[PDB]
Design an enzyme around this catalytic site. Structure first.
Site, PDB file in Angstrom:
ATOM      1  N   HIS A 159      45.815  -8.075  32.132  1.00 28.08           N
ATOM      2  CA  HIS A 159      45.896  -9.551  32.052  1.00 28.08           C
ATOM      3  C   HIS A 159      45.124  -9.806  33.335  1.00 28.08           C
ATOM      4  O   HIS A 159      43.948  -9.483  33.450  1.00 28.08           O
ATOM      5  CB  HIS A 159      47.345  -9.990  32.319  1.00 28.08           C
ATOM      6  CG  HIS A 159      48.121 -10.455  31.097  1.00 28.08           C
ATOM      7  ND1 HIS A 159      48.576 -11.739  30.965  1.00 28.08           N
ATOM      8  CD2 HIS A 159      48.511  -9.789  29.981  1.00 28.08           C
ATOM      9  CE1 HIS A 159      49.222 -11.874  29.812  1.00 28.08           C
ATOM     10  NE2 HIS A 159      49.198 -10.687  29.195  1.00 28.08           N
ATOM     11  N   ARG A 160      45.871 -10.316  34.317  1.00 28.12           N
ATOM     12  CA  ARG A 160      45.566 -10.454  35.729  1.00 28.12           C
ATOM     13  C   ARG A 160      46.837 -11.005  36.375  1.00 28.12           C
ATOM     14  O   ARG A 160      46.925 -12.215  36.739  1.00 28.12           O
ATOM     15  CB  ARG A 160      44.415 -11.370  36.065  1.00 28.12           C
ATOM     16  CG  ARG A 160      43.148 -11.272  35.242  1.00 28.12           C
ATOM     17  CD  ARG A 160      42.562 -12.683  35.226  1.00 28.12           C
ATOM     18  NE  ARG A 160      41.349 -12.791  36.029  1.00 28.12           N
ATOM     19  CZ  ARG A 160      40.135 -13.033  35.527  1.00 28.12           C
ATOM     20  NH1 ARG A 160      39.965 -13.191  34.223  1.00 28.12           N
ATOM     21  NH2 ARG A 160      39.089 -13.107  36.336  1.00 28.12           N
TER      22      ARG A 160
END
Ligand SMILES: Cc1cc2nc3c(=O)[nH]c(=O)nc-3n(C[C@H](O)[C@H](O)[C@H](O)COP(=O)(O)O)c2cc1C
Ligand SMILES: Cc1cc2nc3c(=O)[nH]c(=O)nc-3n(C[C@H](O)[C@H](O)[C@H](O)COP(=O)(O)O)c2cc1C
Lengths: 154, 162
Positions: free
Chosen positions: A132-133
């Protein structure tokens, strides 16, 4: 051939324990210069300066690296002992940041004009991977002969 | 075993130095990307707090030209606050894999929303090029170091010791 996940419940009591786990993995994996760290210094005007140096030893009193004592870093350190260290392990989505004071090593442990510094461990941050982040970040703040731990934002 | 193969170099002579340090920088960056290194555009930015304490974190280079180097950050992040209080910053590209380092010293100025447009409240700063240093891998631990200092719309160049 990956790594993902740094939650509060994997956190050891001594940050150096998590550091060693990361430094081995770095050496295990390819990572060239596992021990290379970028040391930041600040000159008399407020300007930071950067350069890589190799981590040579480390225990609770700090991290040690060697250098010519007449180079820009040594000189800057002598006017400002505040420095910062950063292990740039971005190949494994990692990063380790250490803030602390650079005391000049003794002419004893070095066994001319070429010495070394020991950077005390006032703070140590661990930044980790992110599918994702959702960057995992955890800070160790040295407080009262103890480690105050905290989770930070990505 | 390699289809894309690989390779490395040596010798940073004063003769091969370009007039514009960003030509050499562009060459080392192409050369970092060719040798499939991890995050060739990854750089370590160093800021300083009011007490004079330095902090460091990796950021990615999104664009560069004679005006400076650009990177993006969230506008309400610690490094953003440190720059607003002190624009002095250092950038270091950690290319040890290739025996290289590049250091840039300059002042970080917030970009206009028009700039951020190129590619929460995610913004961009541009570090000017007051100095750019180059470090290469000469044989017997005897290293090659060059400093480009900006002075009166031009570049003073000097070799440094290893
Ligand atoms: C992978 C690598 C390892 C290095 N290790 C050291 C070291 O342990 N000590 C040192 O003083 N310089 C070391 N250097 C050189 C520094 O980057 C720097 O040029 C030098 O210390 C003088 O910097 P200063 O003039 O900013 O003081 C190393 C460079 C690389 C790329
Ligand atoms: C390869 C890599 C690239 C990264 N790129 C960015 C970036 O471009 N901008 C950014 O703000 N943070 C980036 N980060 C995370 C920062 O280093 C850091 O966690 C964050 O911005 C810390 O900011 P602070 O010191 O302002 O609180 C990256 C980390 C890695 C390992």
């Amino acid at each position: 051939y990956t790594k993902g996940g740094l939650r509060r419940r994997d956190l050891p009591a001594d940050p150096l324990t998590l550091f060693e786990r990361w430094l081995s993995q770095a050496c295990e994996a390819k990572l060239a210069d596992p021990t290379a760290m970028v040391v930041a210094t600040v000159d008399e005007h407020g300007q930071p300066y950067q350069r890589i140096v190799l981590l040579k030893h480390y225990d609770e009193k700090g991290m040690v690296f060697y250098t010519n004592l007449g180079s820009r870093k040594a000189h800057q350190i002598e006017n400002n002992p505040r420095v910062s260290l950063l292990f740039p392990w971005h190949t494994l989505e990692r990063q380790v940041m250490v803030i602390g004071k650079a005391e000049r090593l003794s002419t004893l442990e070095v066994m001319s004009f070429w010495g070394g510094f020991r950077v005390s461990l006032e703070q140590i941050e661990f930044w980790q991977g992110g599918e994702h982040r959702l960057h995992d970040r955890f800070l160790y703040q040295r407080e009262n002969d103890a480690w105050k731990i905290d989770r930070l934002a990505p």
